[PDB]
Symmetry: D2
Subunit: 460 residues, 4 copies
Amino acid sequence: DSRYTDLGLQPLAGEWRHGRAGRRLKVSNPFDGSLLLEIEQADRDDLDAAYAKAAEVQPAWAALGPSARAAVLYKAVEVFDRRHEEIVDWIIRESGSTRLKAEIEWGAARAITLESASFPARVHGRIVESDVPGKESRVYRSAIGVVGVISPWNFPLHLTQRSIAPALALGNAVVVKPASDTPVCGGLLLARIFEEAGLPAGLFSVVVGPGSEIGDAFVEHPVPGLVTFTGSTPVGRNIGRIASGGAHLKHVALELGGNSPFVVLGDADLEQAVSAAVFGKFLHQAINRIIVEDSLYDAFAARFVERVKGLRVGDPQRADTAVGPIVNARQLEGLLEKIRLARQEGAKPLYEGGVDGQLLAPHVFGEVTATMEIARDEIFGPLVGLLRARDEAHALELANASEYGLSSAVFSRDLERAVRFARQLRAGMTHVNDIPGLGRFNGDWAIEEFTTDHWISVQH
Amino acid sequence: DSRYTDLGLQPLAGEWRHGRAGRRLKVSNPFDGSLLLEIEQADRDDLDAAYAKAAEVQPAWAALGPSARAAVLYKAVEVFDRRHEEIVDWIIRESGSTRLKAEIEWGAARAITLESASFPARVHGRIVESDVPGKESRVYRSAIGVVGVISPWNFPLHLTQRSIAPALALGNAVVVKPASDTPVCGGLLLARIFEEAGLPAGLFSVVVGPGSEIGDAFVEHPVPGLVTFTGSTPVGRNIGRIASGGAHLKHVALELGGNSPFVVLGDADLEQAVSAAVFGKFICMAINRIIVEDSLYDAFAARFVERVKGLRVGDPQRADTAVGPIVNARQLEGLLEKIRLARQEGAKPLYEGGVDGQLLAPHVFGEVTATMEIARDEIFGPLVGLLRARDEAHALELANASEYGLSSAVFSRDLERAVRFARQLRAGMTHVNDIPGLGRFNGDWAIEEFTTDHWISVQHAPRQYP
Amino acid sequence: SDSRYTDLGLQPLAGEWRHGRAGRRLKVSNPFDGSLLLEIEQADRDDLDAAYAKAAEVQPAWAALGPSARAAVLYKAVEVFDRRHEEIVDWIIRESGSTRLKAEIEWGAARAITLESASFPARVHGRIVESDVPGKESRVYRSAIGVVGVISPWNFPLHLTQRSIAPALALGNAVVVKPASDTPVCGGLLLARIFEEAGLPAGLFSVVVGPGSEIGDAFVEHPVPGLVTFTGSTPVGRNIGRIASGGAHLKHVALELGGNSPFVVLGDADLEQAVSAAVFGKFLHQGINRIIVEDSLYDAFAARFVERVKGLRVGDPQRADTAVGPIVNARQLEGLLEKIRLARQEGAKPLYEGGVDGQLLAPHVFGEVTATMEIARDEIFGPLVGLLRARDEAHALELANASEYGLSSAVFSRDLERAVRFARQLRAGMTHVNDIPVNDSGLGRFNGDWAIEEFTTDHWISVQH
Amino acid sequence: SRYTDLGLQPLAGEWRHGRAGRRLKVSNPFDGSLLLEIEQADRDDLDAAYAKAAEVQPAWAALGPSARAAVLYKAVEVFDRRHEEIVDWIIRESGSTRLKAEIEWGAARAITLESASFPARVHGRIVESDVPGKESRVYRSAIGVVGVISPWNFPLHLTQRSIAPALALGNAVVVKPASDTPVCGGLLLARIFEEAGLPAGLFSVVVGPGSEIGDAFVEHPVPGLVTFTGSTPVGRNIGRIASGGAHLKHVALELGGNSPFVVLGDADLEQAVSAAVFGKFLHINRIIVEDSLYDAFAARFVERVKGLRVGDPQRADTAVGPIVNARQLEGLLEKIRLARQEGAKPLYEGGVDGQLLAPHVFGEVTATMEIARDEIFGPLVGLLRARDEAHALELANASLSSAVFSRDLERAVRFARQLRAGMTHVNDGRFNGDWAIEEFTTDHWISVQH
């Protein structure tokens, strides 16, 4: 039917209204610079109201039967399907993501939502044995209460929904703080979807405000039982201190992005390794460093560069666009700085595409070493370094030098060797020989995350 | 210090006494035929009393804390150590087991006892939400009640303890019916060990009786919530029929021995396979068929036969003895018939050993086919058939030919291929490149087997009931 | 689609919808008016062999698909449940003679089972285990059993069939269903149509409708099925159990056997709740045979119980107001007449006796019944109930536990602590405190844990590196 | 022989003196008599302990479950073996009563026995995939090295609570004990584990000047996890150091709190009084009673409190023993004062004789008084008056553990669930394999494409 309108309105304490901060925020398309919409920012009082209301209405939401809460999640899946193109179109225009990656982001969010609908049925308390005669110990598993979610600019919709959908399903309320560049895909859109899906008012608020005023207060506030953030390391690190530093001590769930290594061993299928690297780094769902055994390195570099030159940079609305615009000026300036820093540190430039406004074309460097910043620090854009490895042991040392490892990959025709190498990696996941709810986030992970246990021992 | 005496007395309904059947069972050594002991057998009043007593005292046992029940299991481990040789000697004398096998049986039984000590603390009830307003669901996990255990002649002590120890630890009571050839090993000794370790009287009864009198009644009885059996397929078939056929219906857990295939693919390390196969066969970790890809067949057959010749057939008390006597004459007669039929069916005699009383030497046959009896039927002795496979696809057909699969093994230097092959086998367990408490057994299985769920839904609020 | 299913007499056999080759015709009739619903060409033994063989053949490809693909089919099946709601409920009433009220309940339960099962595939887990042996790893793989043979009852044919079919299929098994001769449609045939519409590949779901004489034992005896499933009468279930282990090939059997279920009312009970719960469970839902009341509340319970029961309205099941409808078949009915007559001569005090008119058998309530009497000991599948007087709590426990076999139970008392203590001593798998002993999202009984245990098996592979 | 040379520190697999060149005296709180003297450890020592733990840990983790379990079993035998010796050290060092010391010993022994089964139970998983030919394997492995910060309250038992499962699950461990209780701080636990056949280097204890090595312990790069149970202020501090430092460290934080003891109108009064006295004094900070029952409870409570002996901890009769340290006592005396100035009614006041602090009971306490609201580490308790159950709930809520007494269990359980505490005892656990395995192991997903 009709596409959502008045997206500038904020869901605050059960009502859709303007924020009272007295300042306007412009939301712009990174590609052509066009004005998408304008938002009246929210002040600190707006934040307090949203947390209070979430706390007030949450018990009644938790009191509902599991099927009732699941009905909302199923209904949200249904809205995802009806507003497919509308959702994808918002992700492209606001975040600057290509249509290919927006479609993937749509699918991921829908899948999380469908998975979460089954979670209420799976929540289970425990009855425990006791040595004391006449004593029964019962453990009740209940919702935490209110969860505060901080959204990134990178994959706002999918990464927001990854916390939002399970938290809500398991009987919590949520308040979300999106990135200033991506308020709509930061949970304003998600809030509209959950409302049409029959979520009671007040359970989901979104606070869009100046980070100077509302920033630290979001974390420090006494109401939230848990604060979740997935994204940048410096941002996450700050969230860490504010949590510990504050008068109240808050549980925080931090998933911090890292430089993730892609390792190609000597016996690897070359063509398959090259395709997987290109899909991983540029086409995307990450990969920030590619390490190749010396015997394969020269041939890998040549073929990789050849494919990367073929990658189409342009308007993200097109289905054939591989590389689109960087989301904002700050991120762009950072990537341009990393390019110049790479040059001074003596990395060999293999391919350098032209920067055209927010469109940063692929940049590939070679002869990289573990100490260079391009190896050490995380990259959020089309810049990647190629490392030479002397042997398997050297490849392992290079891969583990990153220290912080969210993901990894290893390529080798010998599966036994690949798996044995993978096990020595200091990373949470490794993908072996990957050709282009089941995996990663799981119901058991979510239930533990967004519930708490109360041990109640009863003496007869 | 002194070993157990008066083993002829039966633990029946909380007392150690004679059976009232009025008939005596002779228990004798398979090697020399010397008489070990005589037991006054139990009648059907004895069985009823044993079951009744177990049902009566079991609640108090379950009501104890996990720590108290665990304490008994720990003390049983101490007895196992102090009476090590006594136990091993009884296995050898009574069952005719070689000292080498007896030591393995001892270690296996000891490990079961230790592990089981930890089980009580892991047992967990669950609390569930409800769509009905004002309803809460509590699920309690409790002991079944009384478990009836039938012990085989093959590995009496270990296989009995594998059921007995976890069931007792988890708050059940047990009644055991041992095989007529091995009553002491099948729980008469275990009851003495558990009694020494402080198990309250009446939780563990042993019923040694005429298979005519007590046999069907033991399975048919209304008291036991579960009946467990590990051993021969025809026996298990009989137990299964009586269980479902009888007036009273109970769950039955049947672990039935079968012809288990040992598969050697083309690329396999020949020397390792042969030694593994020899150590394997010469048991309910059984190897009954050896299937080799055509390229290695002749080389495998040659090496295998030759190590087999090296195995010494002798007195089981000797530590060096590899092969010992068959448990009873009827089992020996079946093996002798199996050897006879094999020649009849066209199997090529690779090696023929002498039968000297109960001492039956290894017999190895070659060029065996799937239709031959030696391949398809279960063997409980030192008789082996070797099968030739043209390709890997043929080897898979040959391995999955047997109706009953419990264990299997695959030998190949390519682990990916070996595991891929293994996944196609119709078997519960496969060993890859290994000479056949972390495998099976384990708490999860034990808790599932010997406890049950009781759903109790509590309504705290009134219901319209349309 | 828009139009109702037609040609419901065709059997799904080995990937094809055709007539059976037995040369015998089975007539499906409405229990109420006796009218002809449809005619079925019965299946012979060759049809049975073909259905099993096809199921074995196509099952690996179904298992080899991903969890999401299998779950999609079950999501589409719920989809069909909604579009053909009234069509399904009408079939239940006409074939089984179930009331509209009970038919709606059955529809809902079946829909919920189907929807819950869609979540099951992704939850299946194998295991990785550590070894004392150096360089050794144990990997445990969890897979579908293969083919499941499902025997379905006449009482709640649709729901109880789906209770096995939906989870088994979801987890990558194939199924063959042998429904009751009185209810073949609401057995496998309507469900097979639904699953085909939802995009289930051909050959994964067969239904075999045949004379119990030839193909009866053969269904259970056959070598391909890895599991045989049955819920219903104890005598029938006993038969299935014997054939299973008695036969040449040994399979697992899962038997949920119907039994005399005790409904206990202690002295402090909420009487109106207890009475309402007893009437509604015994009549209008079931799919509770002995009522045990403490002596203090006994006479009070009997009066109110008899009073409500007399009000229960016996008639045409299509009517929304009908509480009691016809007995399914003639054999079933005149088993019930015998139970009534035997109760009288064993000395049961007849509290209320309604008139039997054709298949319509009105409620019958007896009092002062004892444990030794047949009305207490044996299960009844119909509107016949006995009331027992218990002197104290201890006596009530004894009377309830005499049954041996305890699938479900109920206890009514305002003292929740005492009710639970009593409930724990019940020899039953489920007890309901202050509510009807009626099952059921994943909250009770069927759930992923149960389903995965029942419809998958483990393969341990130890690897030496 | 009893253990000797207990002053030696297990550092990088060598027992030896600290490099810091400063000496610590460890003294009995009762007599003030000097127990032993320790050479403090420097920051160079601390770096060595972590380095050694990291290098030797893989070999320990590479062993089979049975090998690691066997060490744990031997430690249990030592606990029985040196029962009296261990109990004596607890009384001596921490000032714990003989009654309380025995409980600590029994608890610690149970932890050690529990943990022997843990190696066997740890499992990886295999997960299904939509991608054709893809298998997902998840491996469970030890964290690596775990740093444990030990308190002085129950040093022995609370240390082992972390040490035993961590070690069993194939981790290595470094312990930094409280300065008042270095021996029961795992300096002694180290000898037991050594006697039980624990390989050298896996278990290190650093006793050093809190000024130098304090923050360096938490900030260090090597430890995968840091564990601490003790004061909120002390633990709170540890929090910042974690996220404040250059690298980010996982921390497991168990912070003590004011735990409310709630007595409803229908409670059996005898059980309430007996339970209250047994809990607080014979090791709960605040007692809340409904108005109707308040006065009767208050009367009987002080009666039993009057009867407790304050004396030498070695005696089996001694109910109350000495406060561990001078601040704790001076803070204890200060806390009494401010309840005095804030207008709490003192029901019973005991005399302080040296370290020995007799029971102090106050009445008519309010939520806004520091005594109720702020954690207490001694034999000082306040009684609060509740008009109704709703008022009683509000009192308890404003405040780790809790208790509710009511003869109606349904009512008691209803109330308990509305308490936001982790644990409630009704009319009167954690640890366990599930928690331990999760805490001291980590998951590695590995996807294999065939």
